[PDB]
Ligand binder design. Structure first.
Ligand SMILES: OC[C@H]1O[C@H](O[C@H]2[C@H](O)[C@@H](O)[C@@H](O[C@H]3[C@H](O)[C@@H](O)[C@@H](O[C@H]4[C@H](O)[C@@H](O)[C@@H](O[C@H]5[C@H](O)[C@@H](O)[C@@H](O[C@H]6[C@H](O)[C@@H](O)[C@@H](O)O[C@@H]6CO)O[C@@H]5CO)O[C@@H]4CO)O[C@@H]3CO)O[C@@H]2CO)[C@H](O)[C@@H](O)[C@@H]1O
Ligand SMILES: OC[C@H]1O[C@@H]2O[C@H]3[C@H](O)[C@@H](O)[C@@H](O[C@H]4[C@H](O)[C@@H](O)[C@@H](O[C@H]5[C@H](O)[C@@H](O)[C@@H](O[C@H]6[C@H](O)[C@@H](O)[C@@H](O[C@H]7[C@H](O)[C@@H](O)[C@@H](O[C@H]1[C@H](O)[C@H]2O)O[C@@H]7CO)O[C@@H]6CO)O[C@@H]5CO)O[C@@H]4CO)O[C@@H]3CO
Ligand SMILES: [Ca+2]
Ligand SMILES: [Ca+2]
Ligand SMILES: [Ca+2]
Ligand SMILES: [Ca+2]
Lengths: 597, 597
């Protein structure tokens, strides 16, 4: 290396909650040196040396009296000296109290490579290991930050208030770089997306449009081409001594009274795939690194929260400390973990407030509601079943297992699953039911880019390329363009208009954000539920059958209290409620009524 | 009619835990009368009248100073007087402390009409509404108490230590009387089975052979031919005023934060079927009636516990009081509730010691483990799945939801589901895996009569008659006799030999009764688990594939601790364990090893 090759974090802030700052310094023979500084309020601790000559860890304590400014950190040894001018930034007013995404928000999810190519010139970047190929399902297609910024008006116009892009951090792999989940530099935006500065600008431009930005963070693993892999900072930085030992994905092993240590270790230490070296988070240097890096991104880019990948694949004790550190800095933040299980108890284990049988404590505010998404996809697909909606009702009834079920993220789909429209059997009427459900449940709704124009995919197993097709209109020359409307079918445009109608309506319905829910047991694949408070009732009724259904309204009188009729927000039709509710085949209605006494 | 037509309970005991005793007296204008008695230690409370002149409720407080003996209760009014000689029996020594069935037991379930016809002369009883018809799948076939007693040596010899017959109380219906679930007289054995005394004899004879007797009690409903229905004791005795209003079976409605009262009431008050009037257990007279009746059967017939039908279909507050009362009398008893859900949270809600979100409390010791049975049947039948056993492992990992998972009843099958052998696809090798699992899990195993000779049924849908075919050998003239072994095929006899082998072995295995369990996540439909303590290890390994599989034993070292080999109890063969476990296609081994320090 040349003097100091990497300084991480590269700068920090005065006035953080945790006073300690640990710098990870990288350069040839830097480990052979001693650090010194002189700045009021900043104390240099006592060297803890690592055996690798090319790394030095420097512990600072930044007292509350430290002012924003800069100071040289000088590194002396072997008759030489090296300098780094370290900067402490002033924090933005209100930084610590930043409001995280919550029940009043709706999240729009993109994959940056697959959304919009605003700058074809950065599709390839000289020096990088992969060449772009738009026709390869696993290739880089060239979407970037410029393209995303170009279309913030569209996203906000649809009624979304938060943007979640899959990771933009450097993934300099020879193949499958596009997906972002195998970081090769945690402190750098992949140059094919743009610069670190462009990412900050994406945040500021989103904010001007009333949208927060949620970063997708991977804690458990990196990519095999990470610069660490050439010269391991410590022998135990990577689990299994830096050699590939696969995980077998026994997720319940971390939360099972009958667990073998072999299985729990294999889950948190095993490598996801050979191309994804697993971080040893039981090493305090690794824990500190990840915690500081994510805090750095939040403070630097003005994030509204995080989506945390591969949640339970990280060490359990590390996760307690990581979530504690993050929530201590930003007490109103939201962070949504991805615990990919359709079992309510497995997901609920991780949410802040949960009383666990083993005393495990977490500070994680939110999780992805895979169980409920799975239940609704089953109801919509199992067309041969008399009462598939029962799975949704019974899954919802388990919400008492979560300390804060209204903070969970419910989603129409994402980059890992069959397209929402395909999961509905390409049945527009069933799709409407799914969309109404998403927009009215006591959850934080998240929507996957492309679903608003009924993009389709394969349905069975895992077929990732199928779920990540280029957004129509994201590339110059596209003959179907969802941004302008050009080339959409009437049905695709109707879907898009309905997404806009419901998402913007939801923004202004406090009863959906924090109201009570009363649902009724589904009967013959009809289902009725209500969101309600002193101000408003919203009645949802769906008929998941190809025949009409007539439901006596006596059953629902604890919610209806004699209401003779109402207007369906969707179709705008009046709907009788006096004695019977007549539902057309495959109908869903959404009826606003005044609040109960 | 007859002066006093019913007196219930007909006698009681000195020295019960609960001092109060409420007599329900029935006869023409008995309600017009005034009761009187004189017996030291017994206090007559003073009448609380009901509008029906044909019923009188007499409230007694039997003090701890009351001695065994008998006394007249005299009823006076309208210039007339009636009397009943009331007996307080002395309790058998050790009655209150009786040990309920538990983890060391194995339960053999029969339907008394379908097991053994020891006396063809009671197949029909003069005056009753249904005639026997052995060729009707829903008819009475003639099984009785005599036949069951005749074959107690068989049941004990198979290794079972408890007998659970489906209900024997009078079911005097014109159709479908055989199954027992629609009582027409809670204080009388159906005369087609025998007398009350014969049932007591069944208990005493079973006890001689080391077996307890578990009674199957229905609390929620009765049959429409119950004598009550002719002259309702009170207008609210039966839910919905004695008129048929069906339940829609929304079982989660009683334990759901979002529940409608309509749905909860429909679950606990709705009639199961038109032929099964639903008891209003919110009426304290009905609550007292059922609590006393079940105590009466336990005390009178020397039962080891109860199996409680249609568990959540009874009023929740009633269940709290009923379980408290029963367990206050018999603190060591076991009672297994039938909460038919494959959702672990739904089942776990009811077990004693559970901290429920709504504060619901219960003294119920046990429930039927439908979730784990369903998981194993899926694993063994869906043989095209790569790792179907993963469902069993994950389900078992949720055991922390239950306060006492070791006290749950796990079963091979029962009278309401597809025959065990048929559910395993008539695959004897996979059926062996089910049987080994049943006999080695940290549960109380229950086995269904006929499964030991691989009786078959339909598998699709619900076909009750198909699950309940007569036991071969239970009727004079049967061509095959499973009791003697005559006329069994080699595969039938092999099944029966394996049941006898494993159940008798299990009686002698404290490590299965109360040892720890450590299981490993299944991989490619192979699964390894251990029962262990300082005295013994039992390693179960199953290969749920039609191909050989080899498992490196390094994975299991926390349990194996370098064991080079062990003897498989099934085959008697020594199995190598030093470096790998080599499993043949579709095999299961039960390797016995020394203790784990
Ligand atoms: O040996 C198992 C399996 O391997 C083969 O699949 C290969 C696959 O074809 C290939 O594309 C690659 O997948 C990549 C993927 O494209 C990337 O996106 C990245 O995946 C990350 C993902 O985007 C994240 O959102 C996140 O999702 C994870 C979850 O965290 C996990 O829990 C797990 O979810 C499973 C869930 O737990 C189960 O309940 C069940 O529903 O199945 C889910 C999987 O569908 O995985 C998801 C999705 O990956 O985290 C991911 C990792 O950061 O990285 C992936 C790995 O490179 O991986 C495979 C090998 O190269 C083969 O086709 C299968 O037949 C075989 O069974
Ligand atoms: O004492 C009554 C009954 O109770 C116990 O089992 C109950 C259980 O407690 C209930 O929660 C409920 O569970 C499920 C079923 O498992 C599920 O299959 C479904 O049930 C429907 C059936 O699918 C459908 O065929 C029909 O069932 C009919 C049945 O075909 C008839 O044979 C007849 O069943 C009688 C049984 O033969 C008799 O043993 C007794 O059942 C007991 C059961 O043994 C006991 O362990 O009485 C019944 C009723 O006469 O009639 C029924 C009803 O017409 O309809 C049902 C209901 O839709 O849904 C329920 C609820 O989720 O049922 C089980 C099993 O009966
Ligand atoms: Ca580009
Ligand atoms: Ca890991
Ligand atoms: Ca008989
Ligand atoms: Ca009932």
């Amino acid at each position: 290396p040349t003097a100091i090759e990497h300084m991480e974090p590269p700068f920090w802030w005065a006035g953080m909650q945790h006073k300690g700052l640990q710098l990870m310094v990288h350069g040839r023979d830097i480990g052979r040196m001693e650090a010194a500084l002189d700045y009021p309020g900043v104390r240099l601790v006592s060297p803890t040396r690592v055996p690798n000559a090319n790394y030095l860890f420097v512990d600072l304590e930044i007292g509350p009296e430290a002012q924003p400014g800069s100071f040289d950190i000088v590194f002396k040894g072997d008759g030489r000296s090296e300098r780094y001018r370290y900067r402490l930034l002033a924090r933005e007013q209100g930084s610590a109290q930043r409001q995280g995404f919550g029940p009043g928000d709706a999240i729009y999810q993109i994959m940056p490579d697959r959304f919009a190519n605003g700058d074809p010139s950065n599709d390839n970047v000289a020096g990088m290991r992969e060449q772009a190929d738009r026709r390869h399902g696993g290739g880089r297609h060239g979407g970037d930050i410029r393209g995303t910024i170009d279309h913030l008006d569209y996203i906000a116009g649809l009624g979304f208030t938060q943007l979640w892009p899959t990771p933009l951090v450097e993934n300099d792999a020879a193949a499958y770089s596009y997906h972002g989940y195998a970081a090769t530099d945690h402190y750098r935006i992949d140059p094919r997306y743009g610069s670190n500065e462009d990412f900050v600008r994406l945040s500021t431009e989103a904010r001007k449009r009333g949208m927060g930005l949620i970063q997708d963070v991977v804690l458990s693993h990196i990519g095999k081409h990470h610069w660490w892999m050439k010269d391991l900072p410590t022998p135990d930085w990577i689990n299994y001594g830096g050699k590939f030992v696969p995980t077998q994905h026994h997720r319940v092993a971390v939360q099972d009274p009958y667990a073998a240590q072999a299985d729990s270790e294999n889950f948190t230490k095993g490598w996801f795939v050979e191309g994804m070296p697993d971080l040893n988070q039981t090493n305090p240097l690794v824990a500190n690194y990840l915690i500081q890096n994510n805090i750095w991104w939040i403070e630097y880019a003005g994030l509204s929260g995080l989506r945390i990948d591969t949640y339970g694949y990280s060490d359990g004790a590390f996760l307690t400390e990581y979530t504690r550190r993050l929530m201590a800095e930003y007490p109103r933040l939201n962070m949504v973990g991805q615990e990919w299980s359709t079992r309510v108890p497995v997901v609920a284990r991780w949410q802040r407030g949960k009383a666990n049988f083993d005393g495990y404590t977490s500070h994680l505010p939110s999780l992805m509601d895979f169980p409920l998404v799975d239940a609704m996809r089953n109801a919509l697909s199992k067309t041969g079943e008399e009462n598939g909606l029962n799975e949704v009702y019974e899954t919802l009834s388990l919400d008492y297992l979560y300390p804060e079920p209204q903070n969970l993220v419910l989603f129409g789909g994402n980059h890992d699953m069959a397209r929402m429209f395909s999961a509905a059997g390409e049945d527009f009427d069933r799709w409407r039911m799914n969309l109404v459900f998403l927009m009215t449940m006591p959850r934080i709704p998240q929507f996957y880019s492309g679903d608003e124009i009924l993009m389709t995919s394969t349905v069975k197993g895992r077929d990732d390329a199928s779920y990540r097709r280029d957004f129509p209109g994201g590339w110059a020359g596209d003959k179907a363009n969802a941004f302008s409307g050009a080339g959409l079918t009437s049905q695709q445009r109707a879907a898009q208009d309905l997404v806009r109608k419901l998402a913007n309506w939801r923004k202004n319905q406090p009863v959906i954000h924090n109201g009570r829910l009363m649902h009724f047991g589904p009967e013959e694949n009809t289902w009725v539920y209500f969101r309600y408070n002193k101000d408003k009732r919203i009645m949802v009724a769906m008929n998941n059958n190809d025949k009409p259904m007539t439901l006596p309204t006596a059953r629902f009188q604890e919610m209806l209290k004699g209401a003779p009729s109402g207007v369906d927000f969707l179709s705008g039709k009046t709907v009788g409620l006096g004695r019977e509710l007549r539902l057309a085949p495959k109908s869903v209605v959404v009826i606003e009524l005044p609040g109960l006494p």
